[PDB]
Design a protein around this nucleic acid. Structure first.
Length: 132
DNA sequence: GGAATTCGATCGAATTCC
DNA sequence: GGAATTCGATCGAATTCC
């Protein structure tokens, strides 16, 4: 459908902490680092999947951000895989951080609109798809 | 009725193919 | 390498089965 067809990176991003994802299990998670929003902005993406792997790959290229992550998780982001969330933050076999579109795609949501993109935990992500 | 399999929105990772 | 395709996953409302 939509997150599969190509698109263009757009958005400002937000200024971020040294404890970024630290609050990814609350409300709508952690925003997309402006520092990263700058790097990805105006880039062409085949699918959201393409954007995701590129996204985490930029995080690993960031001194400030990649330092907050374990050597292990950095190894995964270097190849496009998402970071591993804290156990108390996982939901079944879903264990990697998830990117949530604030305004659903099935409701005309910017697929590649970094201002509509956020980082969450599987646990929290689920409570979002049911109002809680 | 009420338990069981499906469906369809939302996800990330592995495999296939050129 | 990179793109497309395919496989796994959790959940609630929905449909299918006795």
């Amino acid at each position: 459908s939509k997150r599969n067809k190509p698109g263009k990176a757009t958005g400002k991003g937000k200024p971020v902490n040294n404890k970024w994802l630290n609050n990814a299990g609350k409300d709508l998670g952690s925003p997309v680092p402006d520092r990263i929003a700058n790097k990805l902005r105006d880039k062409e993406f085949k699918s959201f999947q393409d954007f995701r792997k590129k996204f985490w790959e930029e995080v690993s290229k960031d001194p400030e951000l990649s330092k907050q992550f374990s050597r292990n998780n950095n190894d995964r982001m270097k190849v496009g895989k998402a970071p591993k969330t804290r156990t108390q933050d996982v939901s079944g076999k879903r264990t990697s951080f998830e990117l949530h579109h604030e305004k659903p795609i099935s409701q005309n949501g910017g697929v590649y609109d970094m201002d509509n993109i956020s980082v969450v935990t599987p646990k929290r992500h689920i409570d979002i798809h049911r109002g809680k």
